[PDB]
Scaffold this active site. Structure first.
Site, PDB file in Angstrom:
ATOM      1  N   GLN A  19       0.859  -1.190   0.000  1.00  0.00           N
ATOM      2  CA  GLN A  19       0.000   0.000   0.000  1.00  0.00           C
ATOM      3  C   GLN A  19       0.895   1.240   0.000  1.00  0.00           C
ATOM      4  O   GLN A  19       0.485   2.330  -0.454  1.00  0.00           O
ATOM      5  CB  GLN A  19      -0.891  -0.066   1.208  1.00  0.00           C
ATOM      6  CG  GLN A  19      -0.156  -0.230   2.467  1.00  0.00           C
ATOM      7  CD  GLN A  19      -1.013  -0.635   3.675  1.00  0.00           C
ATOM      8  OE1 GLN A  19      -0.941  -1.843   4.088  1.00  0.00           O
ATOM      9  NE2 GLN A  19      -1.704   0.258   4.247  1.00  0.00           N
ATOM     10  N   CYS A  25      -4.871  -0.286   3.551  1.00  0.00           N
ATOM     11  CA  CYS A  25      -5.141  -1.603   4.272  1.00  0.00           C
ATOM     12  C   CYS A  25      -6.419  -2.209   3.505  1.00  0.00           C
ATOM     13  O   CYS A  25      -6.659  -3.352   2.978  1.00  0.00           O
ATOM     14  CB  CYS A  25      -4.767  -1.745   5.716  1.00  0.00           C
ATOM     15  SG  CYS A  25      -5.740  -0.806   6.874  1.00  0.00           S
ATOM     16  N   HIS A 159      -5.834  -2.350  11.659  1.00  0.00           N
ATOM     17  CA  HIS A 159      -5.192  -2.672  10.375  1.00  0.00           C
ATOM     18  C   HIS A 159      -5.958  -3.876   9.818  1.00  0.00           C
ATOM     19  O   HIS A 159      -6.285  -4.828  10.558  1.00  0.00           O
ATOM     20  CB  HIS A 159      -3.711  -2.968  10.621  1.00  0.00           C
ATOM     21  CG  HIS A 159      -2.905  -3.242   9.375  1.00  0.00           C
ATOM     22  ND1 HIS A 159      -3.063  -2.498   8.212  1.00  0.00           N
ATOM     23  CD2 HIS A 159      -1.964  -4.183   9.098  1.00  0.00           C
ATOM     24  CE1 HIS A 159      -2.254  -2.982   7.290  1.00  0.00           C
ATOM     25  NE2 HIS A 159      -1.568  -3.978   7.811  1.00  0.00           N
ATOM     26  N   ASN A 175      -0.515  -9.882   4.100  1.00  0.00           N
ATOM     27  CA  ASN A 175      -0.301  -8.491   4.533  1.00  0.00           C
ATOM     28  C   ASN A 175      -0.166  -7.542   3.341  1.00  0.00           C
ATOM     29  O   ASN A 175       0.360  -7.923   2.272  1.00  0.00           O
ATOM     30  CB  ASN A 175       0.971  -8.409   5.409  1.00  0.00           C
ATOM     31  CG  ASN A 175       1.026  -7.110   6.175  1.00  0.00           C
ATOM     32  OD1 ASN A 175      -0.203  -6.500   6.405  1.00  0.00           O
ATOM     33  ND2 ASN A 175       2.053  -6.554   6.538  1.00  0.00           N
TER      34      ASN A 175
HETATM   35  C1  LIG Z   1      -4.595   0.111   7.728  1.00  0.00           C
HETATM   36  C2  LIG Z   1      -4.688   1.668   7.259  1.00  0.00           C
HETATM   37  O1  LIG Z   1      -4.085   1.981   6.248  1.00  0.00           O
HETATM   38  C3  LIG Z   1      -5.617   2.771   7.807  1.00  0.00           C
HETATM   39  C4  LIG Z   1      -4.664   3.716   8.528  1.00  0.00           C
HETATM   40  N1  LIG Z   1      -6.528   2.273   8.750  1.00  0.00           N
HETATM   41  C5  LIG Z   1      -7.714   1.765   8.379  1.00  0.00           C
HETATM   42  O2  LIG Z   1      -8.123   1.749   7.197  1.00  0.00           O
HETATM   43  C6  LIG Z   1      -8.807   1.304   9.312  1.00  0.00           C
HETATM   44  C7  LIG Z   1      -9.313  -0.200   9.017  1.00  0.00           C
HETATM   45  C8  LIG Z   1      -9.928  -0.905  10.265  1.00  0.00           C
HETATM   46  C9  LIG Z   1     -11.293  -1.078  10.351  1.00  0.00           C
HETATM   47  C10 LIG Z   1     -11.856  -1.698  11.466  1.00  0.00           C
HETATM   48  C11 LIG Z   1     -11.024  -2.051  12.547  1.00  0.00           C
HETATM   49  C12 LIG Z   1      -9.621  -1.903  12.440  1.00  0.00           C
HETATM   50  C13 LIG Z   1      -9.101  -1.231  11.303  1.00  0.00           C
HETATM   51  N2  LIG Z   1      -9.841   2.229   9.183  1.00  0.00           N
HETATM   52  C14 LIG Z   1     -10.128   3.347   9.769  1.00  0.00           C
HETATM   53  O3  LIG Z   1      -9.469   3.615  10.831  1.00  0.00           O
HETATM   54  O4  LIG Z   1     -11.145   4.190   9.296  1.00  0.00           O
HETATM   55  C15 LIG Z   1     -12.006   4.380  10.406  1.00  0.00           C
HETATM   56  C16 LIG Z   1     -12.063   5.922  10.859  1.00  0.00           C
HETATM   57  C17 LIG Z   1     -11.044   6.792  10.473  1.00  0.00           C
HETATM   58  C18 LIG Z   1     -11.084   8.127  10.859  1.00  0.00           C
HETATM   59  C19 LIG Z   1     -12.107   8.564  11.611  1.00  0.00           C
HETATM   60  C20 LIG Z   1     -13.168   7.745  11.976  1.00  0.00           C
HETATM   61  C21 LIG Z   1     -13.123   6.386  11.632  1.00  0.00           C
END
Ligand SMILES: *CC(=O)[C@H](C)NC(=O)[C@H](Cc1ccccc1)NC(=O)OCc1ccccc1
Length: 212
Positions: A19, A25, A159, A175
Site C-alpha cells: 500500500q 489496508c 489494520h 499483509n
Molecule cells: C490500515 C490503514 O491503512 C488505515 C490507517 N486504517 C484503516 O483503514 C482502518 C481499518 C480498520 C477497520 C476496522 C477495525 C480496524 C481497522 N480504518 C479506519 O481507521 O477508518 C475508520 C475511521 C477513520 C477516521 C475517523 C473515523 C473512523
C-alpha cells in the site's frame, strides 16, 4: 473441512503488494476477497484495482482509514476494475470508475462472519478467503520476519489484511506491506489458545461479497 487450507496452491491469490505510505489496508484486503471468490466459480484469477476503491469510496477515508466492508459493498453495488485499467499509485483521488468505462468485476452481495468465533472464521475461509482486521500498530508484528506470532500484542484493532489459509494450529495471513515483511509478505499467527478476541484481535470483524 480439510485439516489444511491453502488457496495459494489453489490458484486463488496473486503475488503480494504494498500500500506504501498510504493508509489503505482496507481496499487491498477487499480486492483479495472479491478476487478469491471471483476465481472460485468462474475459474479465472484476476488482479483488481484497490486504487479505484480509494478514489471512489468517499465513505472510507482513503489514504488513511477505511472499511474493508465498504469496499466490497461498493463493488457489489457498482463494480471494480482490473489493476491494469486502474493500477495502484498510492494517493487518493478523483473516481475514475465511470471515466474508466465498463466495469470488469462485480459481485452479488456482501456478508459478515460472526465476530469472535474461530470455528466460524475458518469455515468461511474454507469456502473462500476473507477480509480480517487486527492489531498491527504492533511493534512486534511490525518486525515479524517469519514465524508463528503469539505476541505479544493487543485488542486494539486497526489494520486490515487477509486470511488465505489455516492449519491445525497456524492461521495464514496476507499483509498489505511488501514481500520484505514476515515470510515473503506472509505471516502465520496461532489459533486455538482460548483467546476469543483472537491474538491481535484477528476475530473482531471479518467479511465477504457473494457470487452466484
Ligand atoms: C490500515 C490503514 O491503512 C488505515 C490507517 N486504517 C484503516 O483503514 C482502518 C481499518 C480498520 C477497520 C476496522 C477495525 C480496524 C481497522 N480504518 C479506519 O481507521 O477508518 C475508520 C475511521 C477513520 C477516521 C475517523 C473515523 C473512523
Amino acid at each position: 473441512i480439510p485439516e489444511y487450507v491453502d488457496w495459494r496452491q489453489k490458484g486463488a491469490v496473486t503475488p503480494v503488494k504494498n500500500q506504501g505510505s498510504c493508509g489503505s489496508c482496507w481496499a487491498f484486503s477487499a480486492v483479495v476477497t472479491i478476487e478469491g471468490i471471483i476465481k472460485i466459480r468462474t475459474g479465472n484469477l484476476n488482479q483488481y484495482s484497490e486504487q479505484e476503491l480509494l478514489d471512489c469510496d468517499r465513505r472510507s477515508y482513503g489514504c488513511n482509514g477505511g472499511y474493508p466492508w465498504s469496499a466490497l459493498q461498493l463493488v457489489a453495488q457498482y463494480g471494480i476494475h482490473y489493476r491494469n485499467t486502474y493500477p495502484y499509485e498510492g494517493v487518493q483521488r478523483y473516481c475514475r470508475s465511470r471515466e474508466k468505462g465498463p466495469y470488469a468485476a462485480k459481485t452479488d452481495g456482501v456478508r459478515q462472519v460472526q465476530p469472535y468465533n474461530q470455528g466460524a472464521l475458518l469455515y468461511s475461509i474454507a469456502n473462500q478467503p476473507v477480509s480480517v482486521v487486527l492489531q498491527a500498530a504492533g511493534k512486534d508484528f511490525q518486525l515479524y520476519r517469519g514465524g508463528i506470532f503469539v505476541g505479544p500484542c493487543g485488542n486494539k484493532v486497526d489494520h486490515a489484511v487477509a486470511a488465505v489459509g489455516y492449519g491445525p494450529n497456524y492461521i495464514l495471513i496476507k499483509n498489505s506491506w511488501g514481500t520484505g515483511w514476515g515470510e515473503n509478505g506472509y505471516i502465520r499467527i496461532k489459533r486455538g489458545t482460548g483467546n476469543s478476541y483472537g491474538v491481535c484481535g484477528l476475530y473482531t470483524s471479518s467479511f465477504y461479497p457473494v457470487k452466484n
